[model samples]
Target chain A: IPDAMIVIDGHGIIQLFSTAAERLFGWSELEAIGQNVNILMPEPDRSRHDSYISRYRTTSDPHIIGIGRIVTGKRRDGTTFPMHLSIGEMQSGGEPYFTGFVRDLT
Target chain B: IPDAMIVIDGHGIIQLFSTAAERLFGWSELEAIGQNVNILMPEPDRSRHDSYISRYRTTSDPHIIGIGRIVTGKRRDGTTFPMHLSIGEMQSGGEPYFTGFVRDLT
Candidate 1:
């Protein structure tokens, strides 16, 4: 009954962990949860993530954040897969969190 | 602060009406609500609507229902305009409802 899910903060930091993600990415929940989401992406994509987050934070222009759409998700073995991601803003205590509902296409 | 809005039931019956829609269509909310959405569409589109809805209801195929995408919305004067429609499924009691967030492209 477990489903693939990945939750990240507004800063693109991984937060909630799921067992299905572990099986798909070949990484344990403990190892992946505290790391940045860029690790799940390949070279060029991984390198470009920081700039994307920073740019969105400053400009507040709508692109991927708060926008639910389909995109590619890279695995640990340098393999890419299609994924449908829905992102919503939430606040816990005083910090902001982004809840991402991830669905694997493969 | 008035914005265009329209709410319809799962059967495609109009429910809530807004001032902006009244101004755009030249029909009062009282006259528009409780009627079918086909009234706002043009000849060919209006005529084909029932068949389209019947097909979707039987097949449950993803086309316009519960899908948020762009489509054309015809005005009362037989003028068709581009509209970005985002639809979400809801339920009140046992009856189903569709909430559409419409944005005019003109």
Candidate 2:
């Protein structure tokens, strides 16, 4: 019941946020889309995520694409929680995009 | 470049239709949501889908809940194409829902 979906561009800017994402992250889709995806993460990874996407863009390699792992997230309330994250890649109109499926672990 | 996502309630009514879906199916999100999901399918299954959902509701068993398969879909232009369809199940607010991932094979 706590699963959510989000999609971002090669630059890690959010492009799509599902209805369940709003309920899980405490942010409305209108507010989340167009923002850097790191806005939903806590400290270390929050600051490091841009580099993650950047590296993938340069090398076409990924650490988590097509695989899922336990991760942490930050809600709009400024609270952090444990979660499981899975990422997939796609392209639209010649632009690369990443889709993430997130499930609350708490 | 031809992947689309759609979510439906236990009644076979669509609840979510992704942006790629709009481009792939030639129907806007505003018109796709709240309609019977079968509107995107062709004859046989289009006529039989309501019974499929009804059967799942009654038995809690499904033919394509977690596995994906090659299926046929109808576009808004009345053209049929081959696609791989994957279905996932979840509960939100104590209500059952299904999410589908569709990839065009044509």
Candidate 3:
């Protein structure tokens, strides 16, 4: 992916990050893997992202999944910018997960 | 599918253009479909592409055919930028064709 790409599990834990993600977020792949995906978000989203995942797991409501939105992206240098984000859900042997495609708009 | 997508026949005639292509190239679906895909390239690639297809047809040498590369993209407005491209070959009813995935690097 030319833009950043990431996969997260039901608990909001980051599973994998693509090479583009390292460049886009200014973090090494090692630094980002296994971390909370919301760590890349800022403020409200950084804290609320887990709740969104929990709510979806219980309610099965796809508020933002499968839909795209423009949101703030936090880089390792502590800089922030607008990015286009589209998240989609998947299941593997009854284990739920998600993939988030992030495109830098700058 | 997230990046700009396209399909072309052995002769380089455009068959399908994804919506992402319209946004990436500044060309509408109506404008790009049925056109030569090389029109979106620049300079040497713009002129040398037909020969590439012809050579591949006769020799079956992949060269850049099944591989990915960083190349220059020409916008409908004549602006140029770098793009990541990967091409895969396919045949339908024994007719040769190719699918090109383009990712804007800028």
Candidate 4:
């Protein structure tokens, strides 16, 4: 059971995409970094993610932060699969960084 | 299933231990870092890991690097469990760094 790890900045820019993540999503780290994290999401969530982050930042409302749940992930080939996503947040130098650990269920 | 990620320097000293790793091994990041990663291993390999790395460095062997295999892990409580371990290597500033992705099989 390989799990994918992805780290993103407050602005939703990808930072670290682990080797397992590259395999799971079919996206190389070189191609994933600095891209919007929503690229790995699908449908309504993909279209609504930026605003989700923005709203979460403004309200500190945690719909999913610190909670691990099943969600869908989109690969580079545009295929989607179910995954268990766990999100952790840390503040670095007054900026927020989010780390997500995803377990592919497909 | 949750997988643990641990990164080590050429000396086998722990560098980055993921949050999931803490939960899996029952060792916090503060307690894990700057410590020999053998702290998370059981017998035989625990004592022989240093030589293993030394041999790999001298011979450029491909025993585990870039290969994923099933192994065992030791938790802080001294409990042993099976795991699928993937080791990846990268050269940073002329030195080697190893990243291990561990899927607990217990």
Which stretches of candidate 1 lie above 4 Å from their native place? A1-3, B1-106
Q: How does model 3 score by TM-score? A: 0.50
User: Per-residue lDDT for A6 in model 1?
Assistant: 58
Per residue, candidate 2 scores C-alpha lDDT tens digits across A36-81 of: 9999999899999999999988997757765567898999999998
Candidate 3 lDDT over A1-106, as tens digits, reads: 2456666778988766655677899887568867999889889899998898999899988765655778999998989999988665544324665666688999
The better candidate by lDDT, 3 or 4, is: 4
Winner on DockQ between 2 and 4 is: 2
Q: What is the alpha-carbon lDDT for the whole of candidate 2? A: 0.80
Write the residue-wise lDDT of candidate 4 on A1-106 in tens digits: 2367787889899877776788999999779988999999898999999998999999988777655678999999999999988665654334566767778997
* Steric clash pairs (candidate 3): none
Candidate whose DockQ is highest? 2
Tens-digit per-residue lDDT, A1-106, candidate 1: 2235555666888865455677777677678877998898677878898787778668868565445667788877778988876544433333455544457878
Q: The CA-based lDDT of model 1 is what?
A: 0.64
lDDT, candidates in the order shown: 0.64, 0.80, 0.75, 0.78
Which residue pairs clash in candidate 4?
Answer: none
lDDT of 2 at A18: 75
TM score of chain A per candidate: 0.81, 0.95, 0.93, 0.95
TM-score of each: 0.46, 0.58, 0.50, 0.53
Ordered by DockQ, highest first, the candidates read 2, 4, 3, 1
